Amino acid sequence: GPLLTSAIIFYLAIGAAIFEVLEEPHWKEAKKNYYTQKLHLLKEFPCLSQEGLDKILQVVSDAADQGVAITGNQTFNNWNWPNAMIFAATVITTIGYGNVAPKTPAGRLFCVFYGLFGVPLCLTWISALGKFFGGRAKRLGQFLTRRGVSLRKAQITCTAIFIVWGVLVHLVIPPFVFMVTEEWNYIEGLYYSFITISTIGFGDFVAGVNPSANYHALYRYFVELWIYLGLAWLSLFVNWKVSMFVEVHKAIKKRR
C-alpha cells in the first residue's frame, strides 16, 4: 500500500493531538502542585533555604539513579536470587519494564550480551510452546466436535472460542485478581495487562513488587508463568498474520 505510510502519519498526528489534549493539562497541574508544595515545604522551615531543598532533590535524583527507592525501607532487594530470576525473564521477553535496570558498566555490558544471546532463544522457545498448545488444542477441539455433533465450519467457531478464551483470561479476568492482591482498580488492571501482553512494558505497574505487601513464596513465579502463557498464546496470532488476515478480508469485499 503506497498510502499505508500516509495512514501511519495521519494516525500518529491524531494520536499525538489526543494525547496532548488529554494528558498535557494533567501534567501542567501536576507541575504546579509540585512547585507550590516545594514552596510550602520551604515555608515549613525557613532555616532550610531553597538551596538546601535543591541539594535534597539532588540526593534524591541520584539515589533514584542508583536504583534504590525514595519513600523508605528500600529493603526490597531486587537483586537477590529469587528476584533476579524474574528480572532476567523480563529482559529475554523484550518487555524491559524499567523499574529495575543495570547500573554498572560491567553489568551493563553483561546485560547487552545476555539479551543478545537470550532474546532469540526465549522467542524460539515461546514460539514452540505456543505452537504445541495450539496444535493440541485444535486436535482436542476437533475430536470433541466430530465425535459429537459435527459442524460445517467448526474450525471458525473453534478459533473464535480460542481467541475469546485468550482475551478473557488475559485482559478481563486478571484485573480482578490484581484488584484484591495488588489493590488496583479495573482501569489500572486492564492497562497493566495490556502493557505486559504487548511486551511494551512501561514499567510503571509491575506485579509482585511492593514492599508494603504480603505475597506468597511462589507468587512472582505465578505472575511470570501467566506472562509467559500470554506471550505463547499471542505467538499463534502473530504467526497467523496472512492466513487470518485474508480469512477475515475475504468478506470485506462484500462490506466495501
Among 10, 39, 71, 243, binds a copy of itself (CB under 8 A): 71
Among 10, 20, 143, 173, binds a copy of itself (CB under 8 A): 20
Grid cell, residue 23, equals 494528558
Shortest separation between residue 178's beta carbon and a copy of itself, angstroms:
14
* Contacts of a copy of itself in 185-244 (CB under 8 A): 185, 187-188, 190-191, 194-195, 198-204
* Residue 96 binds K ion (CB under 5 A): yes
Nearer to K ion, 96 or 166 (CB): 96
12/15 Cα distance (integer angstroms)? 5
163/119 Cα distance (integer angstroms)? 26
**Residue 44 CB contacts under 8 Å (≥ 6 apart), including other chains:** none
Do 232 and 126 form a contact (C-beta atoms < 8 A)? Answer: yes
Grid cell, residue 79, equals 537483586
Among 94, 127, 142, 239, binds K ion (CB under 5 A): 94
Q: Lay out the site mask for a copy of itself across 120-139 (x = CB under 8 A, - = otherwise).
A: -xx-xx--xx----------
Partner whose binding site includes residue 99, from K ion, a copy of itself, none (CB under 5 to 8 Å by kind) = a copy of itself
Among 33, 157, 210, 243, binds a copy of itself (CB under 8 A): 33
**Alpha helices in 148-218, H assignment, sequence order:** 154-171, 174-181, 186-197
Identity of the amino acid at 245: F
Among 43, 116, 150, 250, binds a copy of itself (CB under 8 A): 116
Helix or strand holding residue 105 (H, E):
helix 105-147
Among 39, 56, 225, 246, binds a copy of itself (CB under 8 A): 56
Cell 532476567 -> residue: 88
Grid cell, residue 122, equals 526465549
Instruction: For the chain, give the number of residues.
Output: 256
- List of residues contacting K ion (CB under 5 A): 94, 96, 199, 201
